[PDB]
Amino acid sequence: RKIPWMLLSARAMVQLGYGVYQQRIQATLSSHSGILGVELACDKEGTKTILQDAGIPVPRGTTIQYFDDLEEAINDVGGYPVVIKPLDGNHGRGITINVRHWQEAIAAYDLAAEESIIVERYYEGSDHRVLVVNGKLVAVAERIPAHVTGDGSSTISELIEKTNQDPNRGDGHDNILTKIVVNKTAIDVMERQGYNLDSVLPKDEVVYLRATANLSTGGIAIDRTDDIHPENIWLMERVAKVIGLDIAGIDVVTSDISKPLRETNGVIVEVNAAPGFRMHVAPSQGLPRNVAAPVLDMLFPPGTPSRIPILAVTGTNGKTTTTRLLAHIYRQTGKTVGYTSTDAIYIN
Amino acid sequence: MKILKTLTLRGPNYWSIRRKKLIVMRLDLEDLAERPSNSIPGFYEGLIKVLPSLVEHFCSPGYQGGFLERVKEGTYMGHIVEHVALELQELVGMTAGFGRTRETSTPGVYNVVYEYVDEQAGRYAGRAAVRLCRSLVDTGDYPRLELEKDLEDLRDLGANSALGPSTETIVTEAEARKIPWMLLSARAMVQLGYGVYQQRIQATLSSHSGILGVELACDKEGTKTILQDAGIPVPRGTTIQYFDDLEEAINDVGGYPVVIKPLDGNHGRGITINVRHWQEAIAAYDLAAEESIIVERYYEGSDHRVLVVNGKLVAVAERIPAHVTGDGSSTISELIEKTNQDPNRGDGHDNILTKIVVNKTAIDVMERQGYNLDSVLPKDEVVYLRATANLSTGGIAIDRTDDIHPENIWLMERVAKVIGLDIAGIDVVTSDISKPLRETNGVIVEVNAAPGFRMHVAPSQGLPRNVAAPVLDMLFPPGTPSRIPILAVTGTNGKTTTTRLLAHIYRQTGKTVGYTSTDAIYINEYCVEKGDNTGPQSAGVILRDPTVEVAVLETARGGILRAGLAFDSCDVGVVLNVAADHLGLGDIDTIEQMAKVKSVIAEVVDPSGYAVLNADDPLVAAMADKVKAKVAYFSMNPDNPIIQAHVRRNGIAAVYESGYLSILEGSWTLRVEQAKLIPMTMGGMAPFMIANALAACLAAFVNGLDVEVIRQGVRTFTTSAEQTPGRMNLFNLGQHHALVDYAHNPAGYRAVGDFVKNWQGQRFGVVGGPGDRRDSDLIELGQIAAQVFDRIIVKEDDDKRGRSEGETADLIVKGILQENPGASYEVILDETIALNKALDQVEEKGLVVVFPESVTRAIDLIKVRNPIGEN
Amino acid sequence: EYCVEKGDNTGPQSAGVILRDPTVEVAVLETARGGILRAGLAFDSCDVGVVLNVAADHLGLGDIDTIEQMAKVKSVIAEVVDPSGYAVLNADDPLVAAMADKVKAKVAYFSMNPDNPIIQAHVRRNGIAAVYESGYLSILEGSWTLRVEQAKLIPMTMGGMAPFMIANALAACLAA
Numbered sequence A: 001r002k003i004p005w006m007l008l009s010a011r012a013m014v015q016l017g018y019g020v021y022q023q024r025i026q027a028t029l030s031s032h033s034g035i036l037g038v039e040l041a042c043d044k045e046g047t048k049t050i051l052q053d054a055g056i057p058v059p060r061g062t063t064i065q066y067f068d069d070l071e072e073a074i075n076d077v078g079g080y081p082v083v084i085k086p087l088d089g090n091h092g093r094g095i096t097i098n099v100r101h102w103q104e105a106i107a108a109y110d111l112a113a114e115e116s117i118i119v120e121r122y123y124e125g126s127d128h129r130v131l132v133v134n135g136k137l138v139a140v141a142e143r144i145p146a147h148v149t150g151d152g153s154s155t156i157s158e159l160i161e162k163t164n165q166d167p168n169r170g171d172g173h174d175n176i177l178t179k180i181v182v183n184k185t186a187i188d189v190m191e192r193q194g195y196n197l198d199s200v201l202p203k204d205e206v207v208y209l210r211a212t213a214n215l216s217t218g219g220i221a222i223d224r225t226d227d228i229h230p231e232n233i234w235l236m237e238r239v240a241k242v243i244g245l246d247i248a249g250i251d252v253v254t255s256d257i258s259k260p261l262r263e264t265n266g267v268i269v270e271v272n273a274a275p276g277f278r279m280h281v282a283p284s285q286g287l288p289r290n291v292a293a294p295v296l297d298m299l300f301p302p303g304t305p306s307r308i309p310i311l312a313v314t315g316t317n318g319k320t321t322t323t324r325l326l327a328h329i330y331r332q333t334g335k336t337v338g339y340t341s342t343d344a345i346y347i348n
Numbered sequence B: 001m002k003i004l005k006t007l008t009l010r011g012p013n014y015w016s017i018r019r020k021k022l023i024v025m026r027l028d029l030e031d032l033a034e035r036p037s038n039s040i041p042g043f044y045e046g047l048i049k050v051l052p053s054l055v056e057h058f059c060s061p062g063y064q065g066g067f068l069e070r071v072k073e074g075t076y077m078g079h080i081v082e083h084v085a086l087e088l089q090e091l092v093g094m095t096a097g098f099g100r101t102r103e104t105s106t107p108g109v110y111n112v113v114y115e116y117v118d119e120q121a122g123r124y125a126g127r128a129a130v131r132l133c134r135s136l137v138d139t140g141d142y143p144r145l146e147l148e149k150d151l152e153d154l155r156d157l158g159a160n161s162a163l164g165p166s167t168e169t170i171v172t173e174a175e176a177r178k179i180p181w182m183l184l185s186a187r188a189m190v191q192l193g194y195g196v197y198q199q200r201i202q203a204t205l206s207s208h209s210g211i212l213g214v215e216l217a218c219d220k221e222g223t224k225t226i227l228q229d230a231g232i233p234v235p236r237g238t239t240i241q242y243f244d245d246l247e248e249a250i251n252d253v254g255g256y257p258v259v260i261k262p263l264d265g266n267h268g269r270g271i272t273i274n275v276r277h278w279q280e281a282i283a284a285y286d287l288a289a290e291e292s293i294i295v296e297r298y299y300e301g302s303d304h305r306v307l308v309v310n311g312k313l314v315a316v317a318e319r320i321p322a323h324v325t326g327d328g329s330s331t332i333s334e335l336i337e338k339t340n341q342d343p344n345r346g347d348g349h350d351n352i353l354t355k356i357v358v359n360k361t362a363i364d365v366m367e368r369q370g371y372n373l374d375s376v377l378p379k380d381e382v383v384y385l386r387a388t389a390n391l392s393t394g395g396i397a398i399d400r401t402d403d404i405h406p407e408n409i410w411l412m413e414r415v416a417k418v419i420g421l422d423i424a425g426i427d428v429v430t431s432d433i434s435k436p437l438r439e440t441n442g443v444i445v446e447v448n449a450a451p452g453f454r455m456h457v458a459p460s461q462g463l464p465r466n467v468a469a470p471v472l473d474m475l476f477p478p479g480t481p482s483r484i485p486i487l488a489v490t491g492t493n494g495k496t497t498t499t500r501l502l503a504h505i506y507r508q509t510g511k512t513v514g515y516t517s518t519d520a521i522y523i524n525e526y527c528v529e530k531g532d533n534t535g536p537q538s539a540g541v542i543l544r545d546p547t548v549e550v551a552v553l554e555t556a557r558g559g560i561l562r563a564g565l566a567f568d569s570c571d572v573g574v575v576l577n578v579a580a581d582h583l584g585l586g587d588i589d590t591i592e593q594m595a596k597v598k599s600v601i602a603e604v605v606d607p608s609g610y611a612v613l614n615a616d617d618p619l620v621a622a623m624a625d626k627v628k629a630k631v632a633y634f635s636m637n638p639d640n641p642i643i644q645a646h647v648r649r650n651g652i653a654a655v656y657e658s659g660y661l662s663i664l665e666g667s668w669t670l671r672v673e674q675a676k677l678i679p680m681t682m683g684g685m686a687p688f689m690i691a692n693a694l695a696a697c698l699a700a701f702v703n704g705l706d707v708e709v710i711r712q713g714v715r716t717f718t719t720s721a722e723q724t725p726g727r728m729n730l731f732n733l734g735q736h737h738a739l740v741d742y743a744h745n746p747a748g749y750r751a752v753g754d755f756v757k758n759w760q761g762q763r764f765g766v767v768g769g770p771g772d773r774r775d776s777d778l779i780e781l782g783q784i785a786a787q788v789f790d791r792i793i794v795k796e797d798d799d800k801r802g803r804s805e806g807e808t809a810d811l812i813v814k815g816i817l818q819e820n821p822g823a824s825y826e827v828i829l830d831e832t833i834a835l836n837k838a839l840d841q842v843e844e845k846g847l848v849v850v851f852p853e854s855v856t857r858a859i860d861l862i863k864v865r866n867p868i869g870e871n
Numbered sequence C: 001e002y003c004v005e006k007g008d009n010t011g012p013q014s015a016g017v018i019l020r021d022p023t024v025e026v027a028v029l030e031t032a033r034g035g036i037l038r039a040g041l042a043f044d045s046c047d048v049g050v051v052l053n054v055a056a057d058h059l060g061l062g063d064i065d066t067i068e069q070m071a072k073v074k075s076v077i078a079e080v081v082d083p084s085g086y087a088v089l090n091a092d093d094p095l096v097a098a099m100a101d102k103v104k105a106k107v108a109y110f111s112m113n114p115d116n117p118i119i120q121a122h123v124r125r126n127g128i129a130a131v132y133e134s135g136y137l138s139i140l141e142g143s144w145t146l147r148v149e150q151a152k153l154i155p156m157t158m159g160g161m162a163p164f165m166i167a168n169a170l171a172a173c174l175a176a
């Protein structure tokens, strides 16, 4: 788009444009991102409170400060199929997504207890990411965790070697997908499903090797941008406006993105300020989206300039005199004029 | 004295329009109701010695002591509980004096109404007043400790809910400018304005403060780097990671007069401002070392704070640390006692200055100056008791706003823009703010995002500045609105229908329209919530919504009586009718009282707006003399003296004339449409639907919509079955019609009866009527079916059976028989299905009218008959 | 600053030259009693009406013999100010301050003495006033004080030695 850019001397910031038309960015945050919105989005209790007061569907749950009351808490929530989380936010740690039994709640409790949002109802559906940029929807993608399937009468370790050779898989960001790695955590996930590495899967059976989806751990991302229902589009835009964030990622759990969330019993789980883009610009299935174009359109709105006039004067003799006169003439229009010479740097 | 019920009102209400904050207590005087003080020995002297301040209370006598002119001649504890609750709040600074007492229900039950400042302190004082007053009518006194502990609880309740001073400063200015404000449910945020014009604040941060700017301002290394790259003067210094190299570092800095700081940021700790010697650097080093910006040159000048709000300078103040001077040949401890008695000094924020406190840190500061507490100072010598300035530690602040040089003003504004912060505090060190910083060798030391204001709004020397005004000017720029239009609809019958039509008309302009009704909360035809959504809690969902441009709200009496109105003022207030519904509930027994509840809407319309009144209703038309707003009228008869007198003075009215719905604007007539061509009205046969349409058209017109927009809106509006179930659902079933409605109060039975009278088909019959909850008005209702219907059948032996059995069917038939004896089938035929099938009792093209116990059954028993469709 | 006509140009015939002029954005008109008594006002209504003082001048002319009658002529300006506008009255003048009870417009006051009960009662209800205090000409807007300048630094006033010039300056500042 011919917009000039520069790196700045502090905090990994980048400047776009010149003079009075400049904007700054830092990764996925910009000069248009407010602090009150970003801080609210990082407060899970705060976010939930604000959204349910607006009539927006969120998960049902409570607060148990490591009291051995989980066995009763489930009664307010609605039964055993619940989610147990550390009370604090310390990444994806100490979390059990589907507690089915009393003793599972206790194992989760003991891990939750390691930190200083508990017992949520577990809603059944897929994990969808919705990207909203200026109070307007840009992209939707469905995320699935690393897995293998019953692709004939093969064992899980055999299936992993068979699919981990796929040419679209590799390290870092040099490929679309990455490699599947078996570790103690893959085993813990497989054990809960009734399987191990030497197990043979039934035809078309799917076994997950991870608890959550992520492209960086070997999962997949499917573009579903054109399959989202008009009412769901309206709700997502309203969520971003209620929490006050320009660029936002919204995490939605639903069985069918093409039907209204009220009919499929779906919920909004999380609102993320300053989300990443790999899953929308390099999906494993579906078509890539130009995510950046909607960002630059809000920073530099249609028919608006990114540059200020530049008058450059050179030659062997007379430059300083010509430069001072020309700056003096522009100054008679009432504008701020900056200039440089061999004597000094001046502004007005 | 037992408390039966407590209500907290927050907004214009029944008791007062202006006294928005009230507590209404329902108190049962089991005792005392029969003993008017003179029957309670000692209850005069006891009450006054416990609460000696109760002389400032006036009652019917407009005199000081007017309360105490009575008491001995009692009021049956009215006035006494009321005045005690008000005095207990006044004793702790909760300043409140409005109150009233009224008898209700059976004798002895009273409504005690009093003003509050804080909601919990208010309710607490009420309960405390009852305990105090009850002990004094049992015994002759009240223990002092049982008064002191209650006053302590009120002081804490009124403190816990307080806003901080920077929020109070902005909120107070917002009220002066008529900008509405609300507290939000999370992170101590405050909302300013409604709908699409809302802004949020939190102390000194706002919706306009960017995150990149705020984070950069908190990074001292980052800030310094960015500013020196812009040509802005900052202190010279280096980075020594607790290596014992300070002795060399000073050589790059320029010598010994240096500043040693902890490398990290952990408040004012481990900092030496002027190192003069090697060993001082080491002591500072050892303290700096406690944290994980060192060796700056020490520049010599005063500490100045500059406040910039929108890339523009607002205020400048000079800050000086707590000190004493050589005010005669006195010692430092003597000088501190002499000046610490100054009347402008005290705790917290209750004074301008605060007290000087000597502690180990004051001593450490004095030792470095060569002084101690027993030292005598030379005349005019100054000794500092603190290393840094702060009003909260006993220092001073001097306004220097008008003494700042034009070049320095330019530089300060450039600094705020370079770091990207809207509201910023800049810390400057200079010997003379009236000269350029380059000439005085001054520097910029720090940039603070979200600074406080006490030093600028309450300086110890110089004039106070209105800091908030420049903040609200950026949030709500000159000639820009803070509110969205509000159209409030009330009256006994027709509110939901009028509300849906009016929202439909505004929607034809392409705006986002939000509305609330008894069925659901909607935004642009999407349903947000379902159920009875009338009342102030729902109104707040629409008003807080960032996308809404127009709000249309149906308003019920339950909401007003229970908690007041949610919006304070509105642009259009529509009152449709007053009728004898809901009497006996909410302490309202008469029609004259019901009219006072409905008039609340008319009395909150802004003077620049309009009240829309029904000129055919004598209680409603009369409200015109209370209204401060303009008045518009509607009627079903052009020959109405009110309408004629009004248009002759160039007022506006809407009338039904010559088959048309038209607007009279002075001498000119504007026809909107024909009644028969507007689908909500059953071919012009439903007068009550015509009246609801006139009210919606007039409200749309007086608020500025064009006539063509109004025509488009009325022509495309529908009220089909399953859109408005139970409200005139007229079904086509071969050579037959059936009507399902849900008349509630008697006016709705008459409204349906007129529809029936206008029908041009075959004979009519009715298969329904009123239940168990009706207060014997059943005979009058039976008398409405009489002479309306040819066949009248009683079905009123339903399942609800709140009392007894099918007694209403018996009372209803007595009414039917008295007015139209001989009507076909004046018997009870069934409870349900064998009667609402009686389409088979009607000839070709006749009609069955249903007044069911439940609409779902009424319509599903028509669907089973294989209907064709809508009439 | 261009002169259109010279001579005594007060009265409704001159006001009409300015009001009919296609280039004028702001009109400032001095109004004399001769014009009002002879032909009425030229403009019907205005935004700001300033009444500076009532004194016993021109008595016996135009059928006005008393000071109470002269006050009724001057009050014509205060009574034609649009309800959305302001009347500016002299609080140190008992005939002028009294006009406040006839005015349908908002009222602002000026004085040479901050300790004037009218001014105090008025600012306590959040009105606006201009006073001379501590060597400064300042505006009182509710609880806040706005200082404009020092009397000695404003050239029309002879170094702060001409109280009547200070009062004229306060009236102009408050109207603006």
Ligand SMILES: Nc1ncnc2c1ncn2[C@@H]1O[C@H](COP(=O)(O)OP(=O)(O)OP(=O)(O)O)[C@@H](O)[C@H]1O
Pocket: A059, A083, A091, A092, A093, A095, A097, A120, A121, A122, A123, A124, A127, A212, A251, A253, A269, A270
């Ligand atoms: N109540 C719930 N019902 C169903 N799934 C849920 C529920 N709560 C969370 N999840 C799932 O758990 C996943 C883990 O996200 P989580 O809410 O734990 O956030 P986090 O701790 O920041 O972890 P991550 O970095 O994976 O987002 C979510 O993406 C979602 O799919």
Ligand SMILES: Nc1ncnc2c1ncn2[C@@H]1O[C@H](COP(=O)(O)OP(=O)(O)OP(=O)(O)O)[C@@H](O)[C@H]1O
Pocket: A315, A316, A317, A318, A319, A320, A321, A322, A342
């Ligand atoms: N157009 C010209 N042609 C020739 N000589 C000139 C011209 N203009 C100025 N001079 C002469 O040359 C000198 C250099 O002037 P000036 O400072 O404006 O030059 P400059 O191009 O900025 O040089 P420098 O390379 O030092 O920056 C002048 O003082 C004058 O004597």
Ligand SMILES: Nc1ncnc2c1ncn2[C@@H]1O[C@H](COP(=O)(O)OP(=O)(O)OP(=O)(O)O)[C@@H](O)[C@H]1O
Pocket: B235, B259, B267, B268, B269, B271, B273, B296, B297, B298, B299, B300, B303, B388, B427, B429, B445, B446
């Ligand atoms: N190089 C310096 N020369 C002179 N005075 C300085 C210098 N650096 C800091 N100061 C003074 O020290 C004071 C203490 O502020 P400091 O820079 O230590 O910030 P801080 O640790 O956040 O403490 P505070 O809460 O008092 O601002 C400054 O207000 C300033 O007056």
Ligand SMILES: Nc1ncnc2c1ncn2[C@@H]1O[C@H](COP(=O)(O)OP(=O)(O)OP(=O)(O)O)[C@@H](O)[C@H]1O
Pocket: B491, B492, B493, B494, B495, B496, B497, B498, B518, B688, B689, B691, B692, B726, B727, B728, B741, B742, B743, B744, B747, B748, B751, B752
């Ligand atoms: N203007 C009117 N006058 C008399 N009866 C009316 C009028 N409008 C409607 N009705 C009748 O009263 C019934 C109540 O209709 P509607 O639901 O619109 O009332 P409402 O005022 O919202 O009542 P509620 O108190 O239940 O909310 C209608 O179905 C109809 O039978």
Ligand SMILES: [Mg+2]
Pocket: A251, A270
């Ligand atoms: Mg997540």
Ligand SMILES: [Mg+2]
Pocket: A316
């Ligand atoms: Mg050269």
Ligand SMILES: [Mg+2]
Pocket: A319, A320, A341, A342
């Ligand atoms: Mg040169």
Ligand SMILES: [Mg+2]
Pocket: B427, B446
């Ligand atoms: Mg500081």
Ligand SMILES: [Mg+2]
Pocket: B492, B581
């Ligand atoms: Mg009702």
Ligand SMILES: [Mg+2]
Pocket: B495, B496, B517, B518, B554
């Ligand atoms: Mg209703």
